[PDB]
Amino acid sequence: DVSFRLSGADPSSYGMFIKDLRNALPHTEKVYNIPLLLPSVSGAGRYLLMHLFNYDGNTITVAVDVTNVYIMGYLALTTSYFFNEPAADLASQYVFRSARRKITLPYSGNYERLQIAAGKPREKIPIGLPALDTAISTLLHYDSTAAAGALLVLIQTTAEAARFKYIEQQIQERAYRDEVPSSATISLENSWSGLSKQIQLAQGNNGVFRTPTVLVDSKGNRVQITNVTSNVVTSNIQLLLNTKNI
Numbered sequence: 001d002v003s004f005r006l007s008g009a010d011p012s013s014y015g016m017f018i019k020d021l022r023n024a025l026p027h028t029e030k031v032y033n034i035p036l037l038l039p040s041v042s043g044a045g046r047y048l049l050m051h052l053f054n055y056d057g058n059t060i061t062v063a064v065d066v067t068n069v070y071i072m073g074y075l076a077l078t079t080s081y082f083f084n085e086p087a088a089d090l091a092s093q094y095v096f097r098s099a100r101r102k103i104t105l106p107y108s109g110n111y112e113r114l115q116i117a118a119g120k121p122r123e124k125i126p127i128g129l130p131a132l133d134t135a136i137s138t139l140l141h142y143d144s145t146a147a148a149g150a151l152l153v154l155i156q157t158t159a160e161a162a163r164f165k166y167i168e169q170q171i172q173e174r175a176y177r178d179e180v181p182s183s184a185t186i187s188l189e190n191s192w193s194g195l196s197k198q199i200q201l202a203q204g205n206n207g208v209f210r211t212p213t214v215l216v217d218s219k220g221n222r223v224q225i226t227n228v229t230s231n232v233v234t235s236n237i238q239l240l241l242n243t244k245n246i
């Protein structure tokens with residue numbers, strides 16, 4: 001599966017990791033040239049395992065649902081941790097079975113619940129490769145409040161980077177220094193579902209969205225995406241959540 005080593009990591013090798021990750025997610029069709037994620041999968045095949053090594057070489061393995069790129073849990077040494085979610089729970093039936101013990105975090109994994117558990121919105125959580133290296137370290141040794149914050153960083157530096165090229169780029173700019181995410185980045189992260197959907201709906205509407213998706217650009221300006229010619233569709237978005245999951 002996909003490995004990433006923070007020791008010696010530079011924008012080039014991170015880009016290689018994000019590409020491996022995108023390439024590990026299965027799809028049969030493409031919609032306007034963007035890989036479409038499957039409606040569902042059955043078995044251990046529904047999950048991808050990422051090996052993340054922090055600067056010092058200590059590792060966690062993270063489980064990602066390959067149909068929506070959600071993190072469902074992770075393994076840290078002999079302990080597995082999963083979110084307080086039916087899906088997450090179901091996932092524990094296929095990975096990290098050889099874990100000595102299994103812990104279930106008090107909270108579910110949506111960005112909103114994790115933000116509460118962490119005690120802060122992600123508009124204030126610095127992300128980047130250094131932050132990812134810290135996140136990894138934080139999850140090795142249990143603390144659930146710390147973990148909520150580290151997961152928000154991990155999700156943004158992996159799942160969200162995979163889904164959007166602009167975000168993978170933001171993280172590359174923060175390869176040797178963390179910075180909180182731009183509003184644009186937040187807007188994007190929040191618009192994945194809608195965008196994935198509106199892009200799929202335009203196949204029978206001449207490339208025009210039933211409903212326009214509102215974002216903020218790389219400077220605080222609210223803009224509307226009405227059709228697939230926009231750069232967010234042509235250049236930015238790299239994966240589509242199958243509408244059979246929206």
Ligand SMILES: *[C@@H]1O[C@H](CO)[C@@H](O)[C@H](O)[C@H]1NC(C)=O
Nearest residue numbers: 208225226227228229230231
């Ligand atoms: C399509 O998108 C372009 C570029 O974003 C925009 O300028 C144009 O007005 C849109 N066309 C329609 C018919 O919505």
